Amino acid sequence: RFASVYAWNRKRISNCVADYSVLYNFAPFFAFKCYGVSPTKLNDLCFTN
Amino acid sequence: YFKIYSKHTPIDLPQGFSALEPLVDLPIGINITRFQTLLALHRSY
Protein backbone atom coordinates (compact mmCIF):
# COMPACT_ATOMS: atom_id res chain seq x y z
CA ARG A 1 0.00 0.00 0.00
CA PHE A 2 1.44 3.34 -1.15
CA ALA A 3 -0.34 6.67 -0.87
CA SER A 4 -0.51 9.39 -3.51
CA VAL A 5 2.05 12.15 -3.99
CA TYR A 6 -0.14 14.37 -1.79
CA ALA A 7 -0.87 13.26 1.78
CA TRP A 8 2.19 11.04 1.37
CA ASN A 9 2.90 8.38 3.98
CA ARG A 10 5.80 9.12 6.33
CA LYS A 11 7.50 6.64 8.65
CA ARG A 12 10.33 7.24 11.12
CA ILE A 13 13.03 4.59 11.56
CA SER A 14 15.11 4.38 14.73
CA ASN A 15 16.63 1.94 17.24
CA CYS A 16 17.60 -0.71 14.68
CA VAL A 17 20.58 -1.78 12.59
CA ALA A 18 20.47 -0.47 9.01
CA ASP A 19 21.58 -2.86 6.25
CA TYR A 20 21.28 -0.97 2.95
CA SER A 21 22.66 -3.79 0.77
CA VAL A 22 19.25 -5.43 0.34
CA LEU A 23 17.81 -2.06 -0.73
CA TYR A 24 19.94 -1.46 -3.82
CA ASN A 25 20.30 -5.22 -4.38
CA PHE A 26 16.76 -5.19 -5.82
CA ALA A 27 16.76 -5.45 -9.62
CA PRO A 28 13.75 -3.19 -10.44
CA PHE A 29 15.33 -0.31 -8.47
CA PHE A 30 16.69 1.40 -11.59
CA ALA A 31 16.37 4.95 -10.21
CA PHE A 32 18.51 5.46 -7.07
CA LYS A 33 19.90 8.99 -6.66
CA CYS A 34 21.60 10.24 -3.49
CA TYR A 35 22.05 13.89 -2.50
CA GLY A 36 24.71 14.89 0.00
CA VAL A 37 25.81 11.24 0.29
CA SER A 38 27.18 8.44 -1.89
CA PRO A 39 25.49 5.04 -2.31
CA THR A 40 28.72 3.19 -1.48
CA LYS A 41 28.99 4.84 1.96
CA LEU A 42 25.42 4.29 3.18
CA ASN A 43 26.36 1.05 4.97
CA ASP A 44 29.12 2.77 6.98
CA LEU A 45 27.42 5.98 8.16
CA CYS A 46 25.80 6.88 11.48
CA PHE A 47 22.43 8.64 11.56
CA THR A 48 20.68 10.56 14.33
CA ASN A 49 17.23 10.47 12.70
CA TYR B 1 12.29 17.25 14.57
CA PHE B 2 10.94 17.70 18.09
CA LYS B 3 12.34 20.03 20.74
CA ILE B 4 11.24 19.98 24.39
CA TYR B 5 12.92 21.57 27.41
CA SER B 6 12.06 21.65 31.11
CA LYS B 7 13.48 23.04 34.34
CA HIS B 8 12.22 23.00 37.92
CA THR B 9 13.39 25.63 40.42
CA PRO B 10 11.98 27.30 43.54
CA ILE B 11 10.78 30.90 43.40
CA ASP B 12 5.71 34.80 38.99
CA LEU B 13 9.05 34.87 37.18
CA PRO B 14 11.76 36.08 39.59
CA GLN B 15 14.94 37.96 38.69
CA GLY B 16 17.03 34.78 38.95
CA PHE B 17 18.69 32.82 36.17
CA SER B 18 17.90 29.28 35.04
CA ALA B 19 18.61 27.29 31.88
CA LEU B 20 16.20 24.84 30.27
CA GLU B 21 17.42 21.33 29.49
CA PRO B 22 16.39 18.69 26.92
CA LEU B 23 14.38 15.85 28.42
CA VAL B 24 12.90 13.51 25.78
CA ASP B 25 13.65 11.81 22.44
CA LEU B 26 10.69 12.03 20.05
CA PRO B 27 11.76 12.06 16.38
CA ILE B 28 8.53 12.38 14.37
CA GLY B 29 7.79 14.75 11.51
CA ILE B 30 4.63 16.71 12.34
CA ASN B 31 3.62 20.18 11.15
CA ILE B 32 2.75 21.22 14.71
CA THR B 33 0.51 24.31 14.61
CA ARG B 34 -1.59 23.58 17.73
CA PHE B 35 -0.95 23.63 21.47
CA GLN B 36 -3.34 22.48 24.19
CA THR B 37 -2.89 22.58 27.97
CA LEU B 38 -4.46 19.97 30.26
CA LEU B 39 -5.78 20.85 33.72
CA ALA B 40 -7.19 18.71 36.54
CA LEU B 41 -10.25 18.94 38.78
CA HIS B 42 -12.33 16.83 41.17
CA ARG B 43 -15.87 17.69 40.02
CA SER B 44 -15.87 14.45 37.94
CA TYR B 45 -17.10 15.86 34.63
UniProtKB/Swiss-Prot annotation, chain A:
Q: What is the effect of changing residue 1 to K?
A: In strain: Mu/B.1.621
Q: What does this protein do?
A: Attaches the virion to the cell membrane by interacting with host receptor, initiating the infection. The major receptor is host ACE2. When S2/S2' has been cleaved, binding to the receptor triggers direct fusion at the cell membrane. When S2/S2' has not been cleaved, binding to the receptor results in internalization of the virus by endocytosis using host TFRC and GRM2 and leading to fusion of the virion membrane with the host endosomal membrane. Alternatively, may use NRP1/NRP2 and integrin as entry receptors.
Q: How does it assemble?
A: Binds to host ACE2. RBD also interacts with the N-linked glycan on 'Asn-90' of ACE2. Cleavage of S generates a polybasic C-terminal sequence on S1 that binds to host Neuropilin-1 (NRP1) and Neuropilin-2 (NRP2) receptors. Interacts with host integrin alpha-5/beta-1 (ITGA5:ITGB1) and with ACE2 in complex with integrin alpha-5/beta-1 (ITGA5:ITGB1). May interact via cytoplasmic c-terminus with M protein. May interact (via N-terminus) with host bilirubin and biliverdin, thereby preventing antibody binding to the SARS-CoV-2 spike NTD via an allosteric mechanism.
| Full protein name | Spike protein S1
Query: What organism does the UniProt record list as the source?
Result: Severe acute respiratory syndrome coronavirus 2 (2019-nCoV)
Encoding gene (name): S
Give the residues of the full protein shown. Answer: 346 to 394 of 1273
